[PDB]
Design a protein around this nucleic acid. Structure first.
Ligand SMILES: [Mg+2]
Ligand SMILES: [Mg+2]
Ligand SMILES: [Mg+2]
Ligand SMILES: [Mg+2]
Ligand SMILES: [Mg+2]
Length: 215
DNA sequence: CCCGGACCTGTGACAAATTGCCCTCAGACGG
DNA sequence: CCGTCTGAGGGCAATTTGTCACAGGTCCGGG
C-alpha cells in the first residue's frame, strides 16, 4: 500500500506559491520528518523516478531545478512568514541530494486538526493549483469518502496565490476552476461537482460536493 | 425620458511557461 | 582494466497557462 501523507491543516491552508515538482518533493519531506528532528532530509534520484514513473535523466532535471527555485520562497501562516530552506541544497554523493528545511517549520508540519491522503491519489495531477484544491477538499472528507464545503473566493485567491488576471471572474472560471475540477475528476478517485453562490451581481463562494468512486 | 456610464458575462487572440521527449558523454561499480 | 547502468548536461515541438480587447446583457440617474 502506498505512502500515507498527513499534514497539519495550517499547511493545507497556508499562503505560498510552489510548482508541481516542488510540491512532489515537499510531500516526501513531510513524510521523512514525520517518521521520527533537525530538519535535514534527503532525496534519491532513482527512487523519485520510480515513484512518479519518470526516467532517471528527467528526474535529475526535475529535482535540480525545483531545488534552486526554492531560494527566496516564503510561507505565511495566518500572520507569520518563514523561509522554507536555511541553506542551499547540495549533493554529497552522485544521485543523492541533501536539504535543510527551516526547523521552525516542524511544528507547522505536525490532535484532531489534520489532513490526510495517500500519495497515489495526487501523483498524476499536473496543475499545482489543483493539488492545492484536492488537499483542501481532503481536509473535509468523511471516513466513508464524501464531503461538502464552501470556500470563499477571496480566500482561495490569497491562499493559493493565484495570478492577478484571475481576479476577473470569467478568467477565474475558465483557466482555474473548470480545469482543476476536470483534472481531479480525471486523475484522482474522487468525483467532484460544484455550484456558485452569489450576492447581487458578484459571485462570492464556491460550494463543492464530492464522493468516492468506490461506491 | 433616454443616452452615457459602471457593472456583469463569455470568447478570440496572442504571449509566456510547462509538458514529456530526445541525444551526449563522463562517474561508479563489479566481473 | 572495460562494459554497463546512471544521471548530469544540452536541447526540442506540442500543449497549457496567463493576459487583455471587444461584443453584448442589466440597472442607474440627470441634461
Ligand atoms: Mg520536468
Ligand atoms: Mg454590482
Ligand atoms: Mg443606439
Ligand atoms: Mg453577433
Ligand atoms: Mg452596450
Amino acid at each position: 500500500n502506498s505512502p500515507r501523507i498527513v499534514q497539519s491543516n495550517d499547511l493545507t491552508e497556508a499562503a505560498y506559491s510552489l510548482s508541481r515538482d516542488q510540491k512532489r518533493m515537499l510531500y516526501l519531506f513531510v513524510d521523512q520528518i514525520r517518521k521520527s528532528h533537525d530538519g535535514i532530509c534527503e532525496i534519491h534520484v532513482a527512487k523519485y523516478a520510480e515513484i512518479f514513473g519518470l526516467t532517471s535523466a528527467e528526474a535529475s532535471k526535475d529535482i535540480r531545478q525545483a531545488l534552486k527555485s526554492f531560494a527566496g520562497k516564503e510561507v505565511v501562516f495566518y500572520y507569520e512568514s518563514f523561509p522554507w530552506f536555511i541553506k542551499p541544497a547540495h549533493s554529497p554523493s552522485r544521485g543523492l541530494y541533501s536539504v535543510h528545511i527551516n526547523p521552525y517549520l516542524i511544528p507547522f508540519f505536525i490532535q484532531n486538526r489534520f489532513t490526510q491522503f495517500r500519495l497515489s491519489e495526487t501523483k498524476e495531477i499536473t496543475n499545482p493549483y489543483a493539488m492545492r484544491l484536492y488537499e483542501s477538499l481532503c481536509q473535509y472528507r468523511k471516513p466513508d469518502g464524501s464531503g461538502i464545503v464552501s470556500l470563499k473566493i477571496d480566500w482561495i485567491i490569497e491562499r493559493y496565490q493565484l495570478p492577478q488576471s484571475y481576479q476577473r471572474m470569467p478568467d477565474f472560471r475558465r483557466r482555474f476552476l473548470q480545469v482543476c475540477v476536470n483534472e481531479i475528476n480525471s486523475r484522482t478517485p474522487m468525483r467532484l461537482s460544484y455550484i456558485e453562490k452569489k450576492k447581487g451581481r458578484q459571485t462570492t463562494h464556491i460550494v463543492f460536493s464530492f464522493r468516492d468512486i468506490t461506491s
